[PDB]
């Protein structure tokens, strides 16, 4: 029985990056050729593994994380990177083994007048640890005066909307992103390629 990658890659709705979705993929045969033989992607980078060797490899589990960000932020979804996305929304570990796959989704996720439903976190007291998720909406105290749950000077709501309009430049157009993590633990493998 094939791993259900279509449920991730072809989902009608993608998460906002601050609330990024994770799907655990386990106890299935993964045919990654549906991915690496595709011409549909704008970014396809694998760390610690070559994607053309994946159909002959076994992992303990696979995780598929997904979200939308603007095109000029896809570069932050890589080990060691910084920026509002890497620091406050979605952080890969330095020793990441997996693939980062992205594609322009302008005709799905933008609209005339603006689609504002996709959010990212703009302020945080500290950087996220790898694979940490923060969905809190506490007012961010940027100064010495406590905010007491009310916004104002130096007291900001911490999430901001992207405003995706189709005439945006490509750096500001929406990109759907899927991060595949290939987990190897001292435990039986449950996700193998067809050749294994």
């Amino acid at each position, epitope marked *: 029985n094939l791993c259900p990658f*279509g449920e991730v*890659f*072809n*989902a*009608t*709705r993608f998460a906002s990056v601050y609330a990024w979705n994770r799907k655990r993929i386990s106890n299935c045969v993964a045919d990654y050729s549906v991915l690496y033989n*595709s011409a*549909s992607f704008s970014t396809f980078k694998c760390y610690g593994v070559s994607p053309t060797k994946l159909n002959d490899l076994c992992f303990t589990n696979v995780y598929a994380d997904s979200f939308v960000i603007r095109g000029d932020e896809v570069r932050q979804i890589a080990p060691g990177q910084t920026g509002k996305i890497a620091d406050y929304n979605y952080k890969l570990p330095d020793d990441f083994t997996g693939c980062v796959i992205a*594609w*322009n*989704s*302008n*005709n*799905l996720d*933008s*609209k*005339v007048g603006g*689609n504002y*439903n996709y959010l990212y976190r703009l302020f945080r007291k500290s950087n996220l640890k790898p694979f940490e998720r923060d969905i809190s909406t506490e007012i961010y105290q940027a100064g010495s005066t406590p905010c007491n749950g009310v916004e104002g000077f130096n007291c900001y709501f911490p999430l901001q909307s992207y405003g995706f309009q*189709p005439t945006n430049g490509v750096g500001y157009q929406p990109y*759907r992103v899927v991060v595949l993590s290939f987990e190897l633990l001292h435990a039986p493998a449950t996700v193998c390629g067809p050749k294994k």
Partner: antibody
Amino acid sequence: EVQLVQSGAEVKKPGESLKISCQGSGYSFTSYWIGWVRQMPGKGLEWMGIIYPGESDTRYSSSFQGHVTISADKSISTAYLQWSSLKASDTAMYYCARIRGVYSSGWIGGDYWGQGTLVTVSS
Amino acid sequence: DIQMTQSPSSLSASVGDRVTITCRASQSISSYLNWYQQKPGKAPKLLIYAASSLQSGVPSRFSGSGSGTDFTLTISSLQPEDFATYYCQQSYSTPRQWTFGQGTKVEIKR
């Protein structure tokens, strides 16, 4: 079984308002886009717009934006199409249709359709 | 803004014939192409999506092919209940710009 059930035929005078409806059953109403298609007498088909119930997202076809309002009420699984001021030009069959979804970077067509609502605008 | 055009305008074919209908887009729509069947007095019915995938419950005699700007609907072994108008529709663009072809009428010769 997925089913879309539309309200009954309507006749209205020019300038009157009108709201027609379409109720989805047999699936998760908040999990699919749903929308409206116009078919004028003896003519072809035209998308008017779509809405994703419960997610604050309505998208209008370019020739219908500003002339109709599409809305939804997820608690009764019902989608709506509304005119503030009808013109005899609005006489048509109106269909609601569930959009099957998306894949890669584009959309799928409508996989389930209502039975249609005839709207007659006449004095 | 993407114009969809269909050919032929109408045709007549006998039971068991193969019907071939084509659809052209004014610019590439990749694979995002749907075929609908509309029988007199009924709502359109989705037959094919993604240019070549069969919608659940649709008989296997319906098939689609093509990509880019040019697409084909084929009905093998035409049945009496297949008389209808068939429409293509691109779903490559935003919903704001989704467009239909003008339909091909299929009549049964007997």
